Amino acid sequence: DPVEDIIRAISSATNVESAANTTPSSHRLETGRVPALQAAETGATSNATDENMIETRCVVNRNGVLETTINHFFSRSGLVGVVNLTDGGTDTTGYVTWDIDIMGFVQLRRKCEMFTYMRFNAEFTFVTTTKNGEARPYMLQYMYVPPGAPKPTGRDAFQWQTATNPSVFVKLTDPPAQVSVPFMSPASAYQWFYDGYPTFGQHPETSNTTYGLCPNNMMGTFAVRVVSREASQLKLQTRVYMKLKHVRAWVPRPIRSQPYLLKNFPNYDSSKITNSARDRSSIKQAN
Amino acid sequence: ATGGSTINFTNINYYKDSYAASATRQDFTQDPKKFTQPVLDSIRELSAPLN
Amino acid sequence: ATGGSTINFTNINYYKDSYAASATRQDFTQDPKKFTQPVLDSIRELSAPLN
Amino acid sequence: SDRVAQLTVGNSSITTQEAANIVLAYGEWPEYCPDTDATAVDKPTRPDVSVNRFYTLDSKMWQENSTGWYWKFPDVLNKTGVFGQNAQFHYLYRSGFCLHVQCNASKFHQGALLVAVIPEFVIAGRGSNTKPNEAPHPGFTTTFPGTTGATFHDPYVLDSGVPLSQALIYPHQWINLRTNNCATVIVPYINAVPFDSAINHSNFGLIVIPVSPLKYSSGATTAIPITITIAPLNSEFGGLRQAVSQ
Amino acid sequence: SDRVAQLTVGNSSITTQEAANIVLAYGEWPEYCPDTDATAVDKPTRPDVSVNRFYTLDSKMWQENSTGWYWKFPDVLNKTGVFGQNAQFHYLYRSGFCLHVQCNASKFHQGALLVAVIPEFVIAGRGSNTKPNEAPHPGFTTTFPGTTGATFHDPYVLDSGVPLSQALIYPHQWINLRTNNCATVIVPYINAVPFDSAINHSNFGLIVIPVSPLKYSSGATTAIPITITIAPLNSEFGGLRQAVSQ
Numbered sequence: 001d002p003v004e005d006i007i008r009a010i011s012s013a014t015n016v017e018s019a020a021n022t023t024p025s026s027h028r029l030e031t032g033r034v035p036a037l038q039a040a041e042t043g044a045t046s047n048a049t050d051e052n053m054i055e056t057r058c059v060v061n062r063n064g065v066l067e068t069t070i071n072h073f074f075s076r077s078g079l080v081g082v083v084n085l086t087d088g089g090t091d092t093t094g095y096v097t098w099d100i101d102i103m104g105f106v107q108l109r110r111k112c113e114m115f116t117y118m119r120f121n122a123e124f125t126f127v128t129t130t131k132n133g134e135a136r137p138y139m140l141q142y143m144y145v146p147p148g149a150p151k152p153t154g155r156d157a158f159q160w161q162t163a164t165n166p167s168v169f170v171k172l173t174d175p176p177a178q179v180s181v182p183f184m185s186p187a188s189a190y191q192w193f194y195d196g197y198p199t200f201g202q203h204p205e206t207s208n209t210t211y212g213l214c215p216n217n218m219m220g221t222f223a224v225r226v227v228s229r230e231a232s233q234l235k236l237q238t239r240v241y242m243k244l245k246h247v248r249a250w251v252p253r254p255i256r257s258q259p260y261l262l263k264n265f266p267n268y269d270s271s272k273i274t275n276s277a278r279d280r281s282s283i284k285q286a287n
Numbered sequence: 288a289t290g291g292s293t294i295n296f297t298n299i300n301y302y303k304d305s306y307a308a309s310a311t312r313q314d315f316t317q318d319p320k321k322f323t324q325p326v327l328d329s330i331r332e333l334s335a336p337l338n
Numbered sequence: 339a340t341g342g343s344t345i346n347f348t349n350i351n352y353y354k355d356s357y358a359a360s361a362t363r364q365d366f367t368q369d370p371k372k373f374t375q376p377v378l379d380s381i382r383e384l385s386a387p388l389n
Numbered sequence: 390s391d392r393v394a395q396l397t398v399g400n401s402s403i404t405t406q407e408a409a410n411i412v413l414a415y416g417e418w419p420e421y422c423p424d425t426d427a428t429a430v431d432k433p434t435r436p437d438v439s440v441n442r443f444y445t446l447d448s449k450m451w452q453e454n455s456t457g458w459y460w461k462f463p464d465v466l467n468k469t470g471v472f473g474q475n476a477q478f479h480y481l482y483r484s485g486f487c488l489h490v491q492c493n494a495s496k497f498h499q500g501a502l503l504v505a506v507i508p509e510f511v512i513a514g515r516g517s518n519t520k521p522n523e524a525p526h527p528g529f530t531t532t533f534p535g536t537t538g539a540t541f542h543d544p545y546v547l548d549s550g551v552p553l554s555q556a557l558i559y560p561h562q563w564i565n566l567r568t569n570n571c572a573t574v575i576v577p578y579i580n581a582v583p584f585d586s587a588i589n590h591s592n593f594g595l596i597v598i599p600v601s602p603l604k605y606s607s608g609a610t611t612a613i614p615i616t617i618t619i620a621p622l623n624s625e626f627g628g629l630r631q632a633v634s635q
Numbered sequence: 636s637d638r639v640a641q642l643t644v645g646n647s648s649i650t651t652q653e654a655a656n657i658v659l660a661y662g663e664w665p666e667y668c669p670d671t672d673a674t675a676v677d678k679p680t681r682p683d684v685s686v687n688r689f690y691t692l693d694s695k696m697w698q699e700n701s702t703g704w705y706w707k708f709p710d711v712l713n714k715t716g717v718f719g720q721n722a723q724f725h726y727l728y729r730s731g732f733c734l735h736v737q738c739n740a741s742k743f744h745q746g747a748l749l750v751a752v753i754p755e756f757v758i759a760g761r762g763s764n765t766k767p768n769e770a771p772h773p774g775f776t777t778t779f780p781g782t783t784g785a786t787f788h789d790p791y792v793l794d795s796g797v798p799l800s801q802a803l804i805y806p807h808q809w810i811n812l813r814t815n816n817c818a819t820v821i822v823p824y825i826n827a828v829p830f831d832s833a834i835n836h837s838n839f840g841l842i843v844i845p846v847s848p849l850k851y852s853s854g855a856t857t858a859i860p861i862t863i864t865i866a867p868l869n870s871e872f873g874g875l876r877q878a879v880s881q
């Protein structure tokens with residue numbers, strides 16, 4: 001009472017179960033009404049349509065729109081990692097850890113990077129074979145070591161007691177292991193691009209190795225062993241396939257045309273930039 | 288269409304957890320107007336954009 | 339939330355024994371006041387404890 | 390009723406006689422953080438008219454060889470006005486922006502500028518090194534240019550390794566010297582967390598690029614600047630402490 | 636809501652940002668032949684979208700000495716598209732037209748063009764001979780120029796012996812380079828018979844003439860073309876037979 005100055009989105013949603021129909025349109029002879037002329041300086045795309053440009057027939061369109069949703073586009077398993085467990089003769093560790101980063105393999109990386117923010121679940125399958133290829137009847141242990149948890153120091157070391165860490169016991173002759181994983185980010189979404197630094201302080205101008213590394217993506221480590229006492233002589237790879245499910249996506253961004261170099265960095269060649277479209281002989285020959 | 292009395296069951300879940308389940312329930316929702324035409328003053332297709 | 343018509347079944351047991359089953363039914367019950375404040379005379383947060 | 394606009398924010402205001410609509414990024418307005426999304430318990434501060442208002446950077450001059458410039462937000466504003474002070478004494482920042490770009494010339498000039506808004510805009514090292522040890526990275530003065538802005542080494546791939554032609558996915562507009570002399574975009578707060586540190590993290594960069602180069606026939610004006618004026622709509626600050634510039 | 640127009644006919648369409656209304660010749664639209672006026676008993680053919688649409692001739696280039704050009708209709712279209720084929724296989728043709736003329740130049744140019752539509756436009760021999768034997772006549776390539784158009788020897792008397800100043804009786808428009816860059820006239824079917832032979836008889840000619848000559852000061856663009864785009868509204872054909880080009 002004594003001091004008065006103290007006292008939405010335009011876009012909406014619509015279900016689309018099939019491709020758009022086409023209504024019939026005849027010609028137009030008159031002034032003042034001009035569907036063709038656009039001005040792109042407003043950042044908005046041309047709203048001109050089939051039916052105001054030419055004369056059209058009527059098309060009932062039963063083409064399905066369904067397969068292109070982000071759920072169906074992103075729910076497929078593809079390789080996020082490869083782990084090499086020697087365990088054999090000579091120098092023998094007896095186990096191998098793999099930090100969980102799905103940016104290590106390009107084919108599934110470029111699909112994710114269409115988007116800035118993502119919130120999903122996961123389905124991991126572990127396909128393990130021997131050096132060339134085979135399956136023998138050896139028991140395996142796949143253990144998840146979340147951030148802050150002790151990493152195992154040896155084949156038999158006590159960190160494999162896994163009274164808490166989830167683990168999978170499986171034989172090489174069994175069908176590949178599989179589990180469901182939740183959304184574990186301490187933020188509200190995963191983000192594949194973080195423009196910023198994780199901590200305060202003075203940042204070197206010569207080499208910034210901390211630029212662009214989001215803390216919220218550090219999920220812990222995956223570790224393998226052969227359950228045993230002495231050692232085996234075999235040598236095996238485990239391939240790791242991640243499926244995305246229940247996925248949501250935000251803020252689409254352009255698709256990367258340059259060859260990747262590093263996992264965690266978008267470094268590209270200042271020399272050698274490859275053109276996004278192949279070159280022809282002349283602009284006047286379509287072919 | 289068709290498929291008379293096919294008794295489909297998928298989404299039934301065997302675990303006490305929601306993320307154990309299987310996609311989707313789909314979604315048919317679209318809003319292209321936020322990416323394609325994100326302008327304050329609405330512009331009709333008949334009128335010229337700039338007057 | 340969500341999960342419309344997901345038809346969940348877990349606690350169904352295949353044996354005649356109760357301990358054969360699977361956890362949990364959960365529990366949301368808490369009583370911190372027995373460990374945290376186990377005093378005869380109740381003390382408010384406003385008042386000073388000792389008068 | 391279209392090409393003429395006035396924008397009034399705080400004690401500042403902007404008029405333009407030549408304008409192409411206004412872009413509202415992703416169809417939302419800036420807003421204060423709702424009680425359901427918030428996490429930090431302490432009470433944020435809301436200066437309103439002292440922070441939210443138009444700040445005007447220096448002008449970038451416009452040449453035939455120019456490859457284009459970029460800025461980072463809030464970073465450009467962290468040293469200026471009362472907005473720069475609040476962001477130093479608080480650990481938690483949230484707000485949107487209203488971006489306005491002025492470039493004018495005369496009916497005998499020509500060119501076009503792409504103005505975009507890129508959420509989480511990550512610059513990229515330039516080199517053939519595939520080892521994360523020997524591989525180059527950009528410097529802090531590059532990643533976060535400040536008021537002085539930065540420039541593109543490779544404007545075609547946007548210095549991030551991504552084609553410029555697809556930049557039209559971001560909220561954008563063009564300055565086409567025959568059509569409009571300004572471009573205005575109103576950006577909501579975008580981030581994967583409700584609040585963040587204005588110092589460590591920049592939400593989005595701004596980009597001005599010559600897709601079509603400046604041309605003028607001799608005798609006309611050679612000096613064309615590009616001025617930038619940005620206002621922080623709907624600001625909040627939390628986690629009050631001592632002052633940290635970086 | 637006036638100077639900007641779009642015309643859509645068939646799979647073709649025309650936009651113009653600078654236009655002076657539209658002329659509808661003699662206050663009528665083209666139409667199909669009514670049952671009461673018709674005579675021939677057989678059923679006409681009506682292709683609609685395949686014939687009715689904008690065809691675009693070559694451009695006539697525009698000079699200081701130019702005396703002006705003319706065309707004949709349907710004759711210009713008898714060799715082109717599906718319209719040219721139907722007119723060869725049928726003995727009986729009827730339709731209207733929509734005529735559009737494009738000439739543009741820059742605010743430092745000047746001139747004016749008279750665009751008219753002349754029903755039953757008869758060219759005339761030029762000579763003093765009063766004996767119908769020794770008296771000269773024009774050639775077929777002159778009477779019916781084709782796509783390539785023809786030119787006036789005497790644009791003042793319109794080559795027919797009639798003053799140009801009174802050509803404003805016909806449906807017309809001007810291209811005045813300071814005002815409009817196009818002229819559009821919509822011609823109904825005019826003739827003393829409901830159908831006729833497209834090959835032997837041309838209903839009307841089109842005329843573009845420089846009443847005021849083109850002028851530009853040195854350094855501006857010397858090359859100005861004049862383009863013509865014409866659409867056959869409401870076409871019918873009858874009397875189907877073998878093909879006759881003439």
Ligand SMILES: CCCCCCCCCCCCC/C=C/[C@H](O)[C@H](N)CO
Nearest residue numbers: 100101102103142143144168181217219
């Ligand atoms: C029994 C073994 C189970 C293994 C469980 C591992 C689950 C880890 C969570 C995976 C979620 C996606 C991974 C995170 C995203 C990207 O990798 C980030 N760039 C990491 O830096």
